[PDB]
Design an enzyme around this catalytic site. Structure first.
Site, short mmCIF file in Angstrom:
data_model
loop_
_atom_site.label_atom_id
_atom_site.label_comp_id
_atom_site.label_asym_id
_atom_site.label_seq_id
_atom_site.Cartn_x
_atom_site.Cartn_y
_atom_site.Cartn_z
N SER A 257 39.88 30.02 28.55
CA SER A 257 38.73 30.20 29.43
C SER A 257 38.85 31.53 30.16
O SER A 257 39.96 31.96 30.46
CB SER A 257 38.61 29.08 30.46
OG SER A 257 39.56 29.20 31.50
N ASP A 258 37.72 32.17 30.44
CA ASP A 258 37.71 33.25 31.41
C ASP A 258 38.00 32.57 32.76
O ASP A 258 37.98 31.34 32.86
CB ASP A 258 36.36 34.00 31.41
CG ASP A 258 36.46 35.42 31.95
OD1 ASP A 258 37.33 35.68 32.79
OD2 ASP A 258 35.65 36.29 31.53
N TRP A 259 38.31 33.36 33.77
CA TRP A 259 38.85 32.84 35.01
C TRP A 259 37.66 32.31 35.79
O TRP A 259 36.92 33.08 36.39
CB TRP A 259 39.56 33.95 35.79
CG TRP A 259 41.04 34.24 35.41
CD1 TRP A 259 42.03 34.57 36.30
CD2 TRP A 259 41.67 34.21 34.11
NE1 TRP A 259 43.21 34.75 35.65
CE2 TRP A 259 43.03 34.53 34.31
CE3 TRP A 259 41.23 33.94 32.81
CZ2 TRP A 259 43.95 34.61 33.25
CZ3 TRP A 259 42.15 34.02 31.76
CH2 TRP A 259 43.49 34.35 31.99
#
Ligand SMILES: *[C@@H]1O[C@H](CO)[C@@H](O[C@@H]2O[C@H](CO)[C@@H](O[C@@H]3O[C@H](CO[C@H]4O[C@H](CO)[C@@H](O)[C@H](O[C@H]5O[C@H](CO)[C@@H](O)[C@H](O)[C@@H]5O)[C@@H]4O)[C@@H](O)[C@H](O[C@@H]4O[C@H](CO)[C@@H](O)[C@H](O)[C@@H]4O[C@H]4O[C@H](CO)[C@@H](O)[C@H](O)[C@@H]4O)[C@@H]3O)[C@H](O)[C@H]2NC(C)=O)[C@H](O)[C@H]1NC(C)=O
Ligand SMILES: *[C@@H]1O[C@H](CO)[C@@H](O[C@@H]2O[C@H](CO)[C@@H](O[C@H]3O[C@H](CO)[C@@H](O)[C@H](O[C@H]4O[C@H](CO)[C@@H](O)[C@H](O)[C@@H]4O[C@H]4O[C@H](CO)[C@@H](O)[C@H](O)[C@@H]4O[C@H]4O[C@H](CO)[C@@H](O)[C@H](O)[C@@H]4O)[C@@H]3O)[C@H](O)[C@H]2NC(C)=O)[C@H](O)[C@H]1NC(C)=O
Ligand SMILES: *[C@@H]1O[C@H](CO)[C@@H](O[C@@H]2O[C@H](CO)[C@@H](O[C@@H]3O[C@H](CO)[C@@H](O)[C@H](O)[C@@H]3O)[C@H](O)[C@H]2NC(C)=O)[C@H](O)[C@H]1NC(C)=O
Ligand SMILES: *[C@@H]1O[C@H](CO)[C@@H](O[C@@H]2O[C@H](CO)[C@@H](O)[C@H](O)[C@H]2NC(C)=O)[C@H](O)[C@H]1NC(C)=O
Ligand SMILES: *[C@@H]1O[C@H](CO)[C@@H](O)[C@H](O)[C@H]1NC(C)=O
Ligand SMILES: *[C@@H]1O[C@H](CO)[C@@H](O)[C@H](O)[C@H]1NC(C)=O
Ligand SMILES: *[C@@H]1O[C@H](CO)[C@@H](O)[C@H](O)[C@H]1NC(C)=O
Ligand SMILES: *[C@@H]1O[C@H](CO)[C@@H](O)[C@H](O)[C@H]1NC(C)=O
Ligand SMILES: *[C@@H]1O[C@H](CO)[C@@H](O)[C@H](O)[C@H]1NC(C)=O
Lengths: 762, 202, 197
Positions: A257-259
């Site tokens: 996942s992106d943050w």
């Protein structure tokens, strides 16, 4: 029974090159308890951008996931490489690879297991205002594809796993709306992420293209983006991750996942996500939907245990494929998160090797792009040299004053040379070799005088008068302009940064030999001056990293002819680009309809019959090249053996043995240096694929001839794959070579194409 | 320049060996922000608060124009690069520029050596009112001794200045006065600092 | 050294260059595979400078010899293929498949930076077999004082095989294979045994 998804998560099997690593990964994962499964799939607190939890009973260490696509960020003792934008402009595959290999060396030697890099088509280039478009390469699927392949390959060859990013149709920063939940206030209570609404043909032909190449190069991981696709989060989008990525591209690696890219626990688990970042990092404020929550979900029966085993298998495949168990990286030493989010001391390590400064310089010299020249360049031995603009010298607070993300200096601060952009894809700099330093060195060799006005020309007392008094007697005057942009915002317009408008206005008032150099993250507005008879030359140097001055000056003085060409289109106005490039709204569910289809950047310009100022693939040399003898060799085909991993892209011509990436013919042409100077030349091949609503032409080849002497010739060559000449059938859901006449064109830019011929398949 | 630069204090930080992290303080370390000759035919028409860079000569009829200035920062960086080191200068006015004080505080603690470049312009047609340093010199020194315990001070000046606040501070490991070196300011200085030639002026 | 430096010409393979006026001059290769260093090792003859010998301005200590039977790979990357028959062939297979990989660590334990050519040798069992056959090398570049680096030796099926005159194919013999690693053909601090079946 409980089949909630239309597209089930296909199990990893290792694919082509990772077979033995898959076997080890699967073996280790079979031993893991539920607690351990949840540990490795969710982030923990640490010094790196992201950290996977250890599996300490099986000897699996924490993995350091570290930004970013120019090299390890927030780290001292490293080099500041040029941005993706800048290598793109070289059109030089050798440099594309070597850049990434050197970044990879510095990554590994700093202790990084997974590099959060490269940017392989998200953002691709739907809007030229994208604040982080600079992190990518070309605004074109084919060239971005080739650059992405090589960028991944260089990184993995150094032993660092790649997290190619961001999957997918991540085409604006505005309203990207990363998930935050802190002090009661969730982002879910304010505004959902912008939804990119993408038709199936566009998704296949434009956006997926580059990611297919990253998958084939062996990208060990893929980062899912912040945007929604058809109103479903990329990070829990089953069509996106499970079917498009994991079935059709046959992707064998982890989706990270992106943050704040993960917005839920169960849908993410079912729809393709493999790693939750940052997890416990960043105070848990970016969501923390797994960890103990994923243990609870597995134990009480709502999430398949075997599903989560496959996630852990995907994470570990890279660990074992790149030999990180038997050649572990050394410890990572720097606090790259920053206080007060993380209080922790930093150590020190120096990983700069001999040859890396010289590589960065050469990327600069090979990319700096000559846009206009009335005869003022190259310089001979001018005796009185004037320089304008704070961009010519240092950041007045120091090269790293703007902080870990190069984005925390005050709005009016004189940041100096724009060697890189703002946000997570920046990096620190051991020094900057400013244009002024490099210009002065050469001035001193000619026994000349040089003076720079580097203050803010509007707000500094006496600055206008100083410029007025300096410029009239100078033989040449250089104006250095820049345009900072960053992650988390889009540029409002094409306007130059700081006092650039005013520097130009003053420069053309007081001098008749103005040479403009632009350090920039993207296209800027020079319409007020580009046709001014006093502007004798213009160049764009993009984001050249630490060797800014010394890469530029040899081109200015004619030691090397400029050979860079534009990796996107330079329109006369923002209104000339794809409409609704960035949607601004307070609506709860923001929408961006990609009604333009495949028609972005030059394909829009070409289709609409709009003439850019400087076209895609344009750049002058100090000599000219003549193209001749176009040959299409249908005898020169070859089976595809040399990819690291294989996709499962369906195609009509499949016979059980062949592939979408076999070369089916090769095209050749001859260039002749037809001027008075040695020069390098980027030759480009475009194909007009026949059909309804088809781009006028699509780049399908480039080949850079180096240092071609006056009157000599070189053969330029262009292998053409089956995919290169195919279209996506929405109805049959496969790739096919359409019927009709294909126009194959070759020349020096997207609109300078002296050679054309026809190919008609059957 | 190399025959004149005068070592006034040395606790043993000089000569330098091969320092890997170098911090530089002071507009005097770099160019006049409006150009070497911006202050006109007598080097005296720049605004009272203008950052005049390296004080390579004084003000008035005794001045002269300059074809370039080899700044202290340029020369220090050249040597840092030879040592595979890193180097960063804060060269704005430390009092009036937003974030300047915070940049200094963040930069200095990890530096192996911190150079502070100070100046004091004086001119024909007026006497100095006192010995005080020009521009932000006092503030630069207060910040430097706060955040670094290897401060090397280099003074470009037309006369005696007041360094009483910091001359006996043991964080100041060396003090040198370089007077007015003309155009070759940086390249005269750095070989003394690095011990290619012993300082020799008095 | 890429060859053995003996103290005397008399220490090398006999009849190395034959001198005759005979109409049909003959050179019988009765030494067999025993040329250069494998002649010296088999005959117990000590060279002055052995195959793979060369000094640095520092020294290297070898440690942590690992044989990883899970680090295998299909041979896919050769430009052209042979048709060499081998006993273990199952139709989907190759003599040049890497069947295991071996690792070791070197540490710069002297007082200057230096580069080190790490070498791997194998005693393949059988009748009249060489004492040691080189099967790997890896040159570490510019290892700083005190630092370590891992050294890596992929081992192909061919690298561990013998030719069967009777069956006319390559095969991996049964018995004990010694795997040695170090800085020359006679400086081999690390060793371990691999036993296939
Ligand atoms: C985001 O939203 C967009 C918009 O909804 C998504 O796009 C859709 O993706 C679907 C697949 O995921 C596509 O479904 C296919 O539709 C085929 C028929 O397409 C026509 O019908 C509709 C009529 O309403 C129309 O939308 C289409 O119009 C577009 O395309 C034409 C042609 O270029 C253009 O002219 C138009 O302007 C539009 O752009 C079409 O006219 C359908 O045949 C296809 O077939 C099935 O495939 C599945 C999966 O394999 C299979 O289960 C079925 O059995 C069937 O295949 C069978 O038939 C074929 C031979 O006929 C055979 O080869 C097989 O083996 C098998 O026997 C499929 O349902 C949909 O068209 C597309 N829509 C648009 C507008 O692009 C996008 O995916 C979403 N993105 C995300 C990330 O979620
Ligand atoms: C030296 O280097 C410095 C950094 O180290 C440079 O300083 C930085 O410079 C940049 C610009 O160059 C500056 O950018 C931001 O400035 C403010 C900061 O708070 C923001 O307003 C700006 O963001 C808005 O504007 C953008 C374009 O209009 C847009 O893309 C962006 O998304 C954002 O707009 C939203 O916010 C508005 C609400 O007020 C809405 O009107 C708008 O429609 C957008 O709405 C969306 O988001 C809202 C959330 O707030 C939401 O309510 C709404 O529903 C919707 O989702 C801009 O990025 C940096 O701040 C600046 N840094 C510092 C520390 O000052 C410096 O310029 C450089 N020097 C030189 C000379 O170049
Ligand atoms: C789940 O992940 C967490 C976080 O990674 C695990 O805890 C951490 O375990 C590691 C060991 O893998 C500890 O690091 C070690 O520290 C010792 C010195 O004490 C050092 O000699 C080793 O080289 C290593 O660096 C770490 O301290 C520890 N962290 C915390 C915050 O407790 C946890 O064990 C994992 N759980 C399971 C069930 O595997
Ligand atoms: C930079 O130089 C200028 C002159 O070129 C200095 O300004 C003068 O300073 C004296 C005091 O020493 C004043 O009495 C003059 O009136 C000033 N002249 C003008 C025209 O304003 C300036 O102080 C110098 N800058 C610094 C930081 O020392
Ligand atoms: C399982 O546990 C999770 C988190 O603790 C919870 O959200 C979910 O509702 C639970 N399921 C059942 C059936 O209790
Ligand atoms: C060009 O420069 C001259 C002075 O060199 C000035 O007088 C003239 O107005 C300028 N022209 C334009 C169009 O800027
Ligand atoms: C996007 O497309 C739909 C039709 O598919 C349309 O009704 C909707 O309003 C469009 N969104 C915008 C913002 O125009
Ligand atoms: C000297 O510097 C240190 C920080 O390096 C600081 O703690 C101390 O207060 C300073 N002492 C004086 C006397 O300025
Ligand atoms: C070589 O070998 C043959 C037998 O194979 C032997 O009879 C012959 O004499 C040998 N020749 C020499 C020169 O040793």
């Amino acid at each position: 029974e409980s089949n909630s998804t239309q597209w089930p998560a296909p199990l990893a099997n290792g694919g082509k090159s990772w077979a033995s690593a898959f076997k080890k990964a699967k073996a280790t994962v079979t031993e893991m308890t539920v607690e351990e499964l949840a540990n490795i799939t969710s982030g923990v607190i640490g010094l790196c951008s992201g950290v996977t939890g250890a599996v300490t009973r099986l000897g699996i260490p924490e993995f350091c996931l570290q930004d970013g696509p120019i090299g390890p960020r927030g780290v001292h003792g490293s080099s500041q490489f040029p941005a993706g934008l800048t290598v793109a402009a070289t059109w030089d595959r050798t440099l594309m690879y070597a850049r990434a290999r050197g970044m990879g060396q510095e990554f590994h030697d700093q202790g990084v297991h997974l590099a959060l890099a490269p940017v392989t088509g998200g953002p691709l280039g739907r809007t030229p205002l994208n604040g982080r478009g600079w992190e990518g390469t070309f605004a074109d699927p084919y060239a971005c594809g080739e650059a992405s392949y090589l960028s991944v390959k260089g990184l993995t060859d150094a032993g660092v796993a790649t997290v190619s990013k961001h999957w997918i149709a991540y085409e604006q920063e505005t309203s990207r709306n990363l998930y935050i939940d802190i002090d009661g206030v969730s982002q879910a209570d304010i505004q959902l992420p912008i939804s990119s609404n993408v038709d199936d043909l566009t998704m296949h032909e434009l956006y997926m293209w580059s990611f297919a190449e990253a998958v084939r190069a062996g990208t060990n991981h893929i980062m899912c983006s912040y945007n929604r696709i058809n109103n479903t989060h990329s990070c829990s989008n089953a069509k996106g991750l499970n079917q498009l990525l994991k079935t059709e591209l046959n992707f064998q690696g982890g989706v990270v996942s992106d943050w704040g890219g993960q917005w839920d626990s169960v849908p993410a688990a079912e729809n393709g996500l493999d790693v939750a970042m940052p997890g416990k990092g960043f105070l848990g404020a970016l969501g923390d939907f797994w960890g103990a929550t994923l243990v609870e979900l597995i134990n009480n029966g709502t999430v398949s245990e075997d599903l989560v085993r496959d996630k852990a298998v995907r994470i570990l495949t890279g660990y074992y494929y790149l030999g990180q168990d038997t050649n572990p990286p050394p410890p990572f030493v720097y606090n790259t998160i920053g206080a007060p989010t993380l209080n922790a001391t930093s150590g020190y390590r120096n990983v700069r090797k001999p040859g890396t400064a010289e590589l960065i310089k050469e990327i600069g010299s090979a990319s700096v792009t000559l846009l206009k020249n009335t005869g003022s360049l190259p310089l001979k031995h001018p005796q009185r040299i004037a320089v304008l603009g704070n961009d010519a010298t240092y950041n007045v607070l120091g090269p790293n004053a703007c902080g870990l993300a190069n984005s925390a200096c005050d709005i009016d601060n004189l940041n100096g040379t724009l060697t890189t952009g703002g946000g997570s894809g920046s990096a620190l700099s051991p020094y900057t070799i400013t244009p002024l330093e490099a210009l002065q060195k050469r001035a001193i060799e000619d026994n000349a005088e040089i003076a720079a006005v580097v203050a803010n020309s509007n707000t500094t007392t006496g600055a206008e008068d100083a410029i007025a008094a300096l410029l009239p007697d100078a033989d040449v005057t250089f104006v250095f302009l820049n345009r900072y942009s960053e992650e988390g915002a889009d540029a409002p317009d094409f306007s130059l940064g700081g006092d650039g408008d005013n520097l130009m206005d003053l420069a053309v008032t007081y001098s008749s030999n103005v040479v403009v150099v632009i350090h920039t993250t993207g296209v800027v507005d020079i319409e007020k001056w580009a046709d001014n008879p006093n502007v004798t030359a213009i160049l764009v140097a993009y984001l050249p990293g630490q060797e800014a001055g010394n890469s530029l000056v040899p081109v200015l003085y004619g030691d090397v002819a400029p050979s860079g060409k534009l990796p996107w289109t330079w329109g006369k106005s923002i209104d000339d680009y794809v409409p609704n490039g960035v949607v601004y709204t307070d609506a709860y569910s923001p929408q961006s309809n990609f009604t333009e289809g495949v028609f972005i950047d030059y394909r829009w310009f070409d289709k609409m019959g709009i003439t850019p100022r400087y076209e895609f693939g344009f750049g002058l040399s100090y000599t000219t090249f003549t193209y001749s003898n176009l040959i299409v060799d249908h005898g020169r085909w070859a089976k595809d053996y040399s990819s690291v991993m294989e996709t499962a892209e369906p195609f009509a011509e499949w016979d059980g043995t062949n592939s979408l990436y076999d070369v089916i013919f090769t095209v050749f042409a001859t260039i002749t240096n037809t001027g008075n100077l040695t020069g390098s030349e980027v030759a480009q091949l475009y194909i007009s694929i026949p059909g309804d609503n088809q781009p006028v032409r699509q780049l399908r080849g480039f080949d850079k001839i180096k240092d071609l002497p006056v009157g000599d010739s070189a053969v330029v060559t262009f292998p053409i794959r089956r995919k290169d000449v195919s279209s996506w059938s929405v109805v049959d859901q496969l790739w096919y070579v359409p019927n009709g006449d294909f126009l194959i064109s070759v020349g020096g830019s997207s609109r300078d194409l002296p050679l054309n011929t026809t190919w008609t398949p059957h």
